Amino acid sequence: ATYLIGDVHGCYDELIALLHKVEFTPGKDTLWLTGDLVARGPGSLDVLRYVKSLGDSVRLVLGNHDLHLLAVFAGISRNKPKDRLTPLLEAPDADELLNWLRRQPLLQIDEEKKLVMAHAGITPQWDLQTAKECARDVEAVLSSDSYPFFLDAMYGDMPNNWSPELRGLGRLRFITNAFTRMRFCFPNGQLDMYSKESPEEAPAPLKPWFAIPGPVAEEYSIAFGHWASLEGKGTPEGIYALDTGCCWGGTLTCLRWEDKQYFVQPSNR
Ligand SMILES: [Mn+2]
Ligand SMILES: [Mn+2]
Structure with missing residues (x-):
């Protein structure tokens, strides 16, 4: 089986409890983090x-x-x-x-x-x-x-707009921010590096990155973590926001890919 778990943030006990819940077995199963x-x-x-x-x-x-x-x-x-x-x-x-x-x-x-x-x-x-x-x-x-x-x-925090012509420090900084810090986008896809609110609470015209149609999301499901204030909800079909804020007193979430079945471990904090 395939299991995907959101941001662990040092919550070792919850991680192991959740994996035991699903009887995660290396050699039979694979874990995505x-x-x-x-x-x-x-x-x-x-x-x-x-x-x-x-x-x-x-x-x-x-x-x-x-x-x-x-x-x-x-x-x-x-x-x-x-x-x-x-x-x-x-x-x-x-x-x-x-x-x-x-x-x-x-x-x-x-x-x-x-x-x-x-x-x-x-x-x-x-x-x-x-x-x-x-x-x-x-x-x-x-x-x-x-x-x-x-x-x-x-x-x-800059540059915040991708171009194939980006070079050097700005290119690496953008790549790093896109993969590891992204939450909100401007309508043209440009990254906003400041707002960390839930989508409902963001200032206009900011929209979640996944609310802007992109070529990867059109052909692939995307699983991600990072955005705990999203609370794992409010996403379109094919988008899986797995970070439910375990280290903040939320929950650790595990998704089994074959049946899209969710398993949740309450925070110990
Ligand atoms: Mn993160
Ligand atoms: Mn995180």
Whole structure:
């Protein structure tokens, strides 16, 4: 079976309880995770250890909190007490865990399931070939010996409009923001990097990225996490918002792909 779970954010106990609910069995089943494995919840260390141990039985995409963790690890960004990352950062296997984490994808595609996953979704300004190329470029920089330089370069809110002519720092920053920070778009598809409200509470003319028809969403289902204030609802057919805010006292959500059946684990907080 295929299971897709939204942002775990260090909620190790809820993750394991949910997987036990569905009798997740590596070798029979595959788990997709929308990223943001770490921060806020208390068990980022256990989450990373477990997810790494799954190997080919897990298909991860990296989220913005995963990237921020790597930046803290590399000395690029300051550790925020609220993230609760110190046990992971101080772990004897931190190097092993985080060198594995930075090699993971930004984008997962399954052609037989006609299914695409990224942390924040797929901007309507991208077709599938462009999404693939951009994921490959940023994955290449993250997996390289020089990844701290890219992690430093990734911070920024501009540019917010895609063009194939984008180059250099702006190109990487846009790609990173599109895959890991996107929520709202302007009518022309341009990213808004400030509003984090629910769609009903956003200022006009902002619309959810998935409310703007895009070539990928026309041919593929898209699963994503990231946008907890969406509460996993209000999405069109074919769009699966799996982040129901577990670390915030919401729930952890698991979707089984074969029957589109949902399983939910209440937050322990
Ligand atoms: Mn996120
Ligand atoms: Mn998140």
